[PDB]
Structure 1
């Protein structure tokens, strides 16, 4: 039971999914060919005799990142109907991902999702992976969200997204895609996690002292986050957390479902020896402003509810001690209407280390998912960039040329404005 289906959309989603499934195969002992020489039933379906297939679907309108999987070392893990390719890439266009190209490939992926969810008996939700700025990862992700909402309904919809960085982004039309996809994210998603590329970059530069990190480290860190999310469900612990439990304890209002996932401890091999890593200090490091994996300032916001997902040799003793010490600190301050704002989960399974990775093995690991008002200012600057581009009507003709109007841009902008007002009015004292 307790199944959860992973959906990977776009290049970012597909690569993060490749890292995630590498990590899961290492976790459960599955070789890349799909063999085991129980608890793996969460993500892997047992077929026939000793053959495990992951409960995943990989979709991209271009076939390069999927043909890498079809010819890579994990080519025998999936079967071809879990790896769906289009003809023309969305080409960083929300319009192409949502209306023109997304329409002839949505039916097949929804059929695959239906066939996958029929096999599961205890489906807990969906883990959807995408990027805001990507045309596929915005448009087709939004289309798949609305189809899943009208199809499955009450099933939990958890998604991970790569929120564009304040200074760094590889696309010129990035804010358009971000606003366009978030206008439907606000209602078709139950809990959306954002991970910023600049934050992973400088976390790798400082904590892991990697001078030249690529997207491989990005996806490995994101895979560690998702593994810590699902560890309370793929193993056993003194304190278990389920996905619906996670939503209930983390989402205070229907429109406030955008928590910040931070992970600790991230250290190289050489710095692990000199540190006697206790639960208290990694818990403190989770609240440290430079360890947040979104480039924002928690000091300038208020924490609303944070979920603490411990794994390894962790006991409730020092967890409670660390939480009390965090409470006694005035730099980290919570909202007045949430006297208890800590959701706690302890798992006995330690985080596995993938060969070739830069993360050193640790007895204890923490993945705090804090819902805070400090993320409003990131969307504030995103709105500023959107307004700067939209005043001159730049790049709008590209979206209009294939079935979109200015009205959708205006309504998405005012929807984000209402969201900003919502964070402002929930962060205020009573």
Structure 2
């Protein structure tokens, strides 16, 4: 089992479309009813859903937000009735310090909800977090929740889908501070999926609805095998151990109109495609640390071995000199059309990601020398006296970059 903590407008939407994808996959009706064709289903549902006496299924989700508008719109959707009104929380009434201050203020009810959800699962495995690191809501609230959660639950995993601000595009003027602080908290508490609007929209090209549909696709494909038990990799901890910051790529990212080219898609061509920098959805002979490829559809392990052999000989990849990939196979949901003969998802750890922080650090250093937009931060208690928090966070990020 698992819980999802989605914050800010970004996280709220991310959750909306993630649950849309999930209910589509598992044959869950918008109202929580189960379709007749899926009555005898074999798919495991406990992982993301828990059924109710009324036979309906409820997501293990909690909605958090500093503002009402987004969730109010969500509850006007056809999927509104599905969620649990008890879990959803809205502030009665764009800065990280303010977000963390509110988090300190509203500890009690949030952790009440979290405890209630936790006690309903026998074998909870970890946590899932969806949020954006730039905006005031996501950054600060996620920081506070991560801190108090790692404190509260020292034996549960914490996984996040953190969305990083666009850089080529000059959105949050105060983004460097929030990003740097959120990164501090991620290193200091997060167990383990980086995301950026820049490269994501780049691949989308070459509305937020479609972008986050792709993101939800990534999340669902990541959790597929856990959802669909097989032989190997039957747990999230198995995933994490096989890799341990990450980046992702998915081959069949094709529009509903781009099915006309039914290209004979082997496993070799897919696994190859997952390697190119173009497909890496995120934007010094930098090299890899780990690679995992989850493959959906018919697959012959002989083909997998041949592809691995050929790629190894062709040396299209580079590895650490000081240490000695993985190809897991799953089964598609029996419901969604198998427009793709075989499909592939890749999650990897690669040193080049360091550059991200070097940019943000460069951004942050490009402001701290002139004290820009610190007036609001001084208002909050945390930065009321000084900003030693900022210095510690910057040095922590520098240490991480040095370690990479």
TM-score (norm 2): 0.93
Q: Helix, strand or coil: the match of 2:82?
A: coil
Give CA-to-partner distance per residue, 1:55-76, whole Å, 9 cap, x none. 1111011111111122211111
The answer for the alignment partner of 2:306 in structure 1 is 321
Aligned length: 393
Structure 1 residues 371-397: Cα deviation after superposition (integer angstroms, max 9, x where no partner): 010101111111111111111110122
For 1:190-221, what per-residue CA distance to the aligned partner results, in whole angstroms no more than 9, with x for missing partners? 00x11111111111111xxxxxxx11111111
Q: Structure 1: how far apart are the matches of 2:286 and 2:6?
A: 31
Q: State how far apart, in whole Å, the 1-side matches of 2:75 and 2:139 are.
A: 24
Alignment of 1:281-320 (within 5 A): 281-295=269-283, 301-320=286-305
Report SS of the residue matched to 1:416: helix
Give CA-to-partner distance per residue, 1:398-429, whole Å, 9 cap, x none: 11211213211111111111011000xxxxxx
**Which residue of the partner structure matches residue 77 of structure 2?**
72
CA contact (8 A) 1:236 1:349 kept: no
Measured in 2, the distance between the counterparts of 1:350 and 1:284 equals 24
Q: How does 1:81-160 map to 2 (within 5 A)?
A: 81-88=86-93, 91=94, 93-99=95-101, 101-160=102-161
The answer for unaligned runs of 5 or more in structure 1 is 207-213, 252-257, 355-359, 424-430
Give the match for residue 67 of structure 2: 62
* CA deviation map 1:4-57 (0-9, x unaligned): 111111111110110000000101111111111351111111110311100111
Q: What is the aligned partner in structure 2 of residue 43 from structure 1?
A: 48
For residues 262-303 of structure 1, what are the alpha-carbon distances to aligned partners after superposition, in whole Å with 9 as ceiling and x for unaligned? 1112123435524211111111111111111110xxx95211
Shift of 1:309: 1.6
Q: Is the 8 A contact 2:44 2:229 kept in 1?
A: no
Distance 1:218 1:161 in 2: 14
* Alpha-carbon distance between aligned partners in 2 of 1:388 and 1:186, rounded to the nearest angstrom: 22
SS of residue paired to 1:270 = coil
Do the aligned partners of 2:27 and 2:335 also contact (CA within 8 Å) in 1? no
- The answer (yes or no) to whether the contact 1:238–1:346 under 8 Å persists in 2 is no
Say whether the 8 Å CA contact 1:314–1:348 is kept in structure 2.
Answer: no
After the TM superposition, which segments of 4 or more aligned residues of structure 1 sit over 4 Å from their partners?
A: 350-354
Three-state SS of the structure 2 residue aligned to 1:361 is coil
Question: What is the CA–CA distance in structure 2 between the aligned matches of 1:10 and 1:216, rounded to whole Å?
Answer: 16
Bigger mean CA offset, 135-144 vs 360-369: 360-369
1:321–1:106 CA distance, 2 compared to 1 (3 A): farther
* 1:126-185 C-alpha deviation (Å, 9 max, x unpaired): 111011101111111011111111111121111110022331251111111000111111
Give the secondary structure class of the aligned counterpart of 2:64: strand
Distance 1:130 1:309 in 2: 24
Separation in 1, partners of 2:334, 2:103? 37
In structure 2, the CA distance between the partners of 1:224 and 1:231, relative to structure 1 (3 Å rule), is same
The secondary structure found in structure 1 opposite 2:241 is helix
> Is the 1:311–1:351 contact (alpha carbons within 8 Å) kept by the matching residues of 2?
no
Counterpart of 1:210?
Answer: none
Q: CA deviation at 1:222?
A: 0.9
- Whether 1:261 aligns to 2:254 is no
CA RMSD of aligned residues (A): 1.9
Of 221, 231, 249 in structure 2, the residue corresponding to residue 228 of structure 1 is 221
Q: 1:238 to 1:324 in 2, by over 3 A?
A: farther
